[PDB]
Design a protein around this ligand. Structure first.
Ligand code: MN
Length: 349
C-alpha cells in the first residue's frame, strides 16, 4: 500500500494555480494525493494591511490568492503543510510561531517543529539564513520595522530540533534555503550549466543552520525551495530534493511512500516535550527566546516519566490531533502559550 505526497517549492501567492496543477496530476494519473508539502514563500496575506510585512521588491508588492482562501471564497482541496521562506506575511507567521492553520486545510509548521501524519515524522525549519540575525530574538507584537528580519532563521532551532531523531527516525525535513554544501553532492556541473549564478558561492551556497540539522537528524528526505530549480543530491542516507517556483514545470514533484497507517495530522510527542521543557526560555511574550537560558540545558532535563506526564497533559488541554481553529492569530498566539505555560507549571520543577 502506497501514499502519494505532493512536494511543492515556492508558491509565491499562486494558490489557485498550484491546486489546479495538483488536480491535473490526479486527473492524468488517476493517483490520489494524500497531502501536500510546500517549502515556503507562501505569502499568506489576509488583507491589504498585511502588505507591510511582505519583504519583496516593489514590483512584487501584490496580494496574491491567499486572501481568497482566508475569506473562504476558495477552499484548499488537500491538506497542505508548509514552512515560511523569505517572502511571507511575516506578522502572521510570528503570531503562529508555534504553528497553526492559516485557513482551512493549510497548516503552518511554525518557526520549526515536527508533526506526525500517516505514520511519518516531518520536521520543518522556516526562513533563510543571514549571519547578522541568527542570534536575534523575536520581538512581539510584530512591528513594521521588523519586515526585514522576521524571516531570517535563528540559530536556536538547532538545539530545539537536535534530539528529535533519538526515539525514531525523521522521514521528511523541510527547509526554504538549501542545507549548506549539499550543492556539491549532486550533478553540480550540470546545475551550473542551467544556473551559472550558483557557481560563485561554491560549497558555501545555502544555510549552515540547515546543514547542521541535516547532519544531526539524517532524515530520509530533505526538501528545499528558494533556488528556482530542480536538483537532487545524496548526503549519505539523506535524499535531497530541491524544487522550483510555481508557474514552472520543476515546482511540483511527488513522493511515493509506503503507507502502513492512514492517520490524521498529529503533534509529534517528542516535539511537544521539547516545547514544554523549553518554556522558561520563551516565558517573556515580548521578547523570545531569552538565550541567557541554555536551550539544550533545559532539554537535558527530559525524562521518560516527565515525557509521559507532558503528553498526558497536552492531550488533555490541546489534544494530540492538530485541528482547525478559526480564532484570529493573535488569540492563537496567546492561547497556545497559555497551555504550554500551564503544562510546564504542572510538572513542578
Ligand atoms: Mn525564496
Amino acid at each position: 500500500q502506497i501514499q502519494h505526497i505532493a512536494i511543492v517549492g515556492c508558491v509565491h501567492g499562486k494558490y489557485r494555480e498550484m491546486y489546479r496543477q495538483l488536480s491535473e496530476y490526479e486527473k492524468s494519473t488517476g493517483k490520489e494525493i494524500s497531502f501536500v508539502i510546500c517549502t515556503g514563500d507562501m505569502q499568506t496575506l489576509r488583507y491589504e494591511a498585511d502588505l507591510v510585512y511582505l519583504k519583496v521588491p516593489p514590483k512584487y508588492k501584490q496580494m496574491g490568492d491567499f486572501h481568497l482562501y482566508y475569506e473562504g471564497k476558495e477552499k484548499a482541496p488537500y491538506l497542505t503543510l508548509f514552512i515560511g521562506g523569505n517572502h511571507e506575511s511575516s506578522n502572521v507567521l510570528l503570531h503562529l510561531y508555534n504553528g497553526g492553520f492559516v485557513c482551512f486545510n493549510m497548516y503552518y509548521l511554525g518557526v520549526c517543529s515536527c508533526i506526525n501524519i500517516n505514520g511519518l515524522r516531518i520536521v520543518g525549519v522556516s526562513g533563510i539564513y543571514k549571519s547578522f540575525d541568527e542570534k536575534k530574538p523575536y520581538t512581539y507584537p510584530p512591528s513594521p520595522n521588523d519586515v526585514v528580519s522576521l524571516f531570517h532563521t535563528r540559530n536556536y532551532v538547532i538545539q530545539m530540533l537536535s534530539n528529535l531523531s533519538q526515539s525514531s527516525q525523521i522521514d521528511i525535513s523541510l527547509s526554504h534555503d538549501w542545507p549548506q554544501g549539499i550543492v556539491m553532492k549532486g550533478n553540480y556541473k550540470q546545475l551550473y550549466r542551467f544556473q551559472p549564478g550558483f557557481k560563485k558561492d561554491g560549497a558555501s551556497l545555502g544555510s549552515p543552520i540547515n546543514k547542521v540539522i541535516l547532519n544531526t537528524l539524517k532524515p530520509k528526505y530533505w526538501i528545499s525551495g528558494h533556488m528556482h530549480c530542480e536538483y537532487h543530491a545524496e548526503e549519505g542516507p539523506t535524499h535531497f530534493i530541491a524544487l522550483g517556483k510555481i508557474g514552472y514545470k520543476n515546482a511540483i514533484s511527488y513522493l511515493d511512500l509506503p503507507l502502513k497507517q492512514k492517520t490524521d495530522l498529529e503533534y509529534d510527542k517528542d516535539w511537544v516535550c521539547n516545547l514544554i521543557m523549553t518554556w522558561p526560555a520563551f516565558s517573556n511574550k515580548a521578547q523570545f527566546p531569552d538565550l541567557s537560558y541554555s536551550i539544550s540545558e533545559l532539554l537535558s532535563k527530559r525524562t521518560k516519566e516527565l515525557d509521559k506526564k507532558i503528553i498526558e497533559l497536552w492531550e488533555k488541554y490541546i489534544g494530540l490531533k492538530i485541528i482547525y481553529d478559526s480564532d484570529t492569530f493573535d488569540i492563537q498566539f496567546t492561547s497556545r502559550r497559555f497551555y504550554i505555560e500551564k503544562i510546564y507549571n504542572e510538572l513542578n520543577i
